[PDB]
Copies of this chain bind each other. A is one copy, B any other.
Amino acid sequence: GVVDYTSLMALAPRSKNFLELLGVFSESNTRYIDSRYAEFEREEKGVTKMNAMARGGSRKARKEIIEVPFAPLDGVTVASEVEAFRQYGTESQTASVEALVQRKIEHIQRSHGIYIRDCQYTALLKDKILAEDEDGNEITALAKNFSTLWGVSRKTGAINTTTAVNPFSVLATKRQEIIDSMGENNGFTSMVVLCTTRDFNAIVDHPDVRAAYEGRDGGAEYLTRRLGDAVDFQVFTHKGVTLVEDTSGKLTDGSAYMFPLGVQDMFQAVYAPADSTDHVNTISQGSYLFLNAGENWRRDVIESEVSYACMVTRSELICDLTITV
């Protein structure tokens, strides 16, 4: 005796974390599937068009299958007043049958968005799929490192800005290495450096560049700043690279990362379907919601789960930079 209420999940769309705002994981490179196994094709080849004749026809991608981790947050009790989920029809919406549903959906979306932000930051920073048990111990049968998955390796770096010299030389060399790795595409938009607030301050005021960054600060001139105005982050552009001060808190100090934006199919995502006998071999809606009124004779629960995974197919283009303060 379970009734589905997944459609109401759209009544309050999630927010957009800093990575989503930067466009690293957007709604474009994210597809909904109908199986627990998700296909990701890392197409690194040429699809160039060329001139042909009026007749004569004329016109090999490594893809991998993984298991999408399951994460239910079904912990929820219906208060028998929040049983106003019998919406639409004729309803009594006003505020009584609208605001309660909106608040419940907003709470669920906040929890799901926190989980998804954790997944995305794990994919970008640790270069692996997030999958952990209740105790906080990684499930090695689901946490698959991308480098060891695609048969590829990632770049590194080592900079200490306290002593002397301009650190941006290493960043430029990494830029040349990355663009050589892209080769026949070279389709990056900008070079961003996700750095902590302390690292940003340390690298922004050292005497080699302490004048240009402070005296000649081009406020509201950077493309990211103009495209932002929804977050209070601080940016600085120099030597063809941009320093971005992440303020989410998940960026551990002493570890800044530099990577390009705009490379197609570099970052992907998926929304596997929910575990059920009715939702098997059926397309997924992303975040689910079921109202169970037969699990317990005393209270009815609101079961909610989300299946989601991320990877960096072109993981070779990420510079796992290390800073020292």
- Asked if A278 is an interface residue, CB under 8 A from chain B, the answer is no
In the bound complex, residues from chain B placing their C-beta under 8 Å from that of A220 are 219-221
The residue in chain B whose Cβ has the minimal distance to the Cβ of A285 is B95
Identify which of residues 39-71 in chain A touch chain B, using a CB-to-CB cut-off of 8 Å.
47-55, 58-59, 69-71
Contact of A69 among B51, B111, B189 (CB under 8 A): B51
Contact of A190 among B216, B222, B232 (CB under 8 A): B232
Contact of A72 among B58, B72, B190, B221 (CB under 8 A): B58
A contact patch SS: loop
A291 and B247 CA atoms in complex are apart in Å by: 49
Q: Give the distance to chain B from A121, nearest Cβ to Cβ, in Å.
A: 13
Binds B, one of A132-140, A148-156, A159-167: A132-140
Contact of A47 among B28, B59, B75, B94 (CB under 8 A): B75
Q: Give the distance to chain B from A217, nearest Cβ to Cβ, in Å.
A: 7
A227 and B154 CA atoms in complex are apart in Å by: 38
Identify which of residues 233-264 in chain A touch chain B, using a CB-to-CB cut-off of 8 Å.
240, 247, 249, 264
A53 and B70 CA atoms in complex are apart in Å by: 7
- Asked if A223 is an interface residue, CB under 8 A from chain B, the answer is yes
A94 and B282 CA atoms in complex are apart in Å by: 12
Number of copies: 5
In the bound complex, residues from chain B placing their C-beta under 8 Å from that of A110 are 264
**Is there an interface contact between A71 and B96, defined as CB atoms closer than 8 Å?**
no
**Is there an interface contact between A231 and B221, defined as CB atoms closer than 8 Å?**
no
- Asked if A103 is an interface residue, CB under 8 A from chain B, the answer is yes
In the bound complex, residues from chain B placing their C-beta under 8 Å from that of A132 are 50-51
**Is there an interface contact between B32 and A99, defined as CB atoms closer than 8 Å?**
yes
In the bound complex, residues from chain B placing their C-beta under 8 Å from that of A147 are none
**Is there an interface contact between B227 and A227, defined as CB atoms closer than 8 Å?**
no
Contact of A71 among B49, B114, B226 (CB under 8 A): B49
| B-contact bits for A4-28, CB 8 A (1 contact / 0 none) | 0000000000000000000000001
Residues of A within 8 A of B (CB): 28, 31-32, 47-55, 58-59, 69-75, 94-96, 99, 103, 106, 110-111, 114-115, 131-134, 136, 139, 142, 186-187, 189-190, 197, 214-224, 226-227, 229, 231-232, 240, 247, 249, 264, 275, 283, 285, 306
